[PDB]
Design a protein around this ligand. Structure first.
Ligand code: HEM
Ligand SMILES: CC(C)(C)c1ccc(C(=O)O)cc1
Ligand SMILES: [Cl-]
Ligand SMILES: [Mg+2]
Length: 393
């Protein structure tokens, strides 16, 4: 009754162009079985949304990668938020929500915007730049480590550690094996920066450590909560900003609309997150037998959610394969949905908004002027290099 498919969603060919295979996955049925990895798959919006919003049945504490923590040891100690279920998830989640709060965003917004404007001004002096290394990577690196309270030394480990974490959610393929082989220096750096003395006053990390006396978390939980922000706090936003620049380069009519109304910056970024979904896929594990999309799934089964596919499902979206900066983007699952929905999304959206606002006000044209290079990662979609010429307004 459930269709079996041989598509490998973690193959290099799939990463190179996932969209035809994602249509095949959607159109085969609401629930498929992926014989390559012995997991269930859901690629339509409806089932992805349903799974995300039923955490009791589709749990996260057995891992949100392929590996089942009841069967195998996690490669690093489990995240106290991403890899926890309610109720243990609840109070650490509340702490991170209050650390990355609206009030915090108000404190840091003016500086984040000034740094975005300064970066675009600097790039316009060069003209021909790499929109990944010089913009999508450089701008978050110029604001987020400082906002964390990290020292200057060792920041070159941050993006490698993030890529390692994302690769480690995948199956035991070459991408994952090589990531773990290379992991030791990045992991050593990140774990050390999680200790209270290494996080500057007033930053996100210091605030986590200050939140250890309310009955929500204890002092020995704060290092791993800092680790969560150093796992997820940079590379995903880098990919989203790079995706937005890629979209504006490929769809010049949308850059023209954005220039005419820079208040579209926040939705232009949200639409880039829907369109390119930096986090492509994520797993749950069933805790009991469940009926989903007419299929009966037993206990202890891995369920692979295709977030990027859900964000391009024509059952949910009109013209899903168009980049439309005035689209009603509410409801996309690029940040997840439900109790685990990205706790850092205010930071991501702030960074993306103020960068796209700077581009909207300062740049007249964005022309690709060199070979575009994709980065392959088991979980993340993103570019390695995006040569562009920037024309000033
Ligand atoms: C465009 C950028 C980003 C994207 C696309 C993204 C995507 C996601 C997604 C899909 C989830 C849900 C995981 C799940 O349901 O299992 C998530 C959760 C999370 N994200 Fe983000 N994220 C981004 C930026 C950030 C930032 C800037 C931070 C930190 C400052 C962050 C920290 C986290 C954490 C800690 C969680 C776990 C929340 C929980 O389990 O309750 N992310 N993210
Ligand atoms: C952004 C993603 C969903 C990939 C993420 C979230 C949280 C963590 C953590 O370490 O808590 C790691 C990665
Ligand atoms: Cl680690
Ligand atoms: Mg090798």
């Amino acid at each position: 009754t459930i269709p079996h498919l041989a598509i490998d969603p973690f193959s290099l060919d799939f990463f190179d162009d996932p969209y035809p295979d994602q249509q095949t996955l959607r159109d085969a049925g609401p629930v498929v079985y992926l014989d390559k990895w012995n997991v269930y798959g859901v690629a339509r919006y409806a089932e992805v949304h349903a799974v995300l919003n039923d955490p009791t049945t589709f749990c996260s504490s057995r891992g949100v990668g392929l590996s089942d923590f009841k069967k195998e040891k996690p490669w690093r100690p489990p995240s106290l938020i991403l890899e926890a279920d309610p109720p243990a998830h609840t109070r650490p989640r509340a702490v991170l929500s209050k650390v990355l709060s609206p009030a915090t965003m108000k404190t840091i917004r003016d500086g984040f915007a000034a740094a975005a404007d300064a970066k675009v001004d600097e790039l316009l002096q060069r003209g021909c730049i790499d929109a990944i290394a010089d913009l999508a990577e450089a701008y978050p690196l110029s604001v987020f480590p400082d906002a964390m309270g990290l020292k200057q030394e060792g920041r070159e480990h941050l993006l490698p550690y993030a890529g390692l974490v994302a690769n480690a959610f995948g199956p035991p393929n070459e991408l994952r094996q090589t990531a773990i082989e290379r992991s030791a220096p990045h992991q050593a750096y990140v774990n050390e920066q999680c200790q209270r003395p290494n996080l500057a006053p007033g930053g996100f990390g210091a605030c986590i450590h200050a939140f250890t006396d309310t009955g929500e978390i204890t002092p020995d939980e704060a290092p791993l909560l800092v680790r969560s922000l150093l796992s997820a706090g940079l590379q995903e936003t880098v990919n989203g900003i790079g995706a937005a620049v890629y979209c504006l380069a490929r769809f010049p009519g949308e850059l023209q609309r954005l220039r005419s109304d820079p208040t579209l910056a926040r939705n232009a970024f949200e639409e880039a997150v829907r369109f390119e979904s930096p986090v492509q896929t994520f797993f749950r594990t069933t805790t009991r037998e469940v009926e989903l999309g007419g299929a009966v799934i037993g206990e202890g089964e891995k369920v692979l959610m295709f977030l990027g596919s859900a964000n391009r499902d024509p059952r949910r979206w009109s013209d899903p394969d168009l980049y439309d900066i005035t689209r009603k983007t509410s409801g996309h699952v690029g940040f997840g949905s439900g109790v685990h929905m990205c706790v850092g999304q205010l930071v991501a959206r702030l960074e993306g908004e103020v960068m796209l606002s700077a581009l909207a006000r300062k740049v007249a044209a964005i022309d690709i002027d060199g070979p575009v290079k994709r980065r392959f990662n088991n979980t993340l979609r993103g570019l390695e290099s995006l040569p562009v010429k920037l024309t000033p307004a």
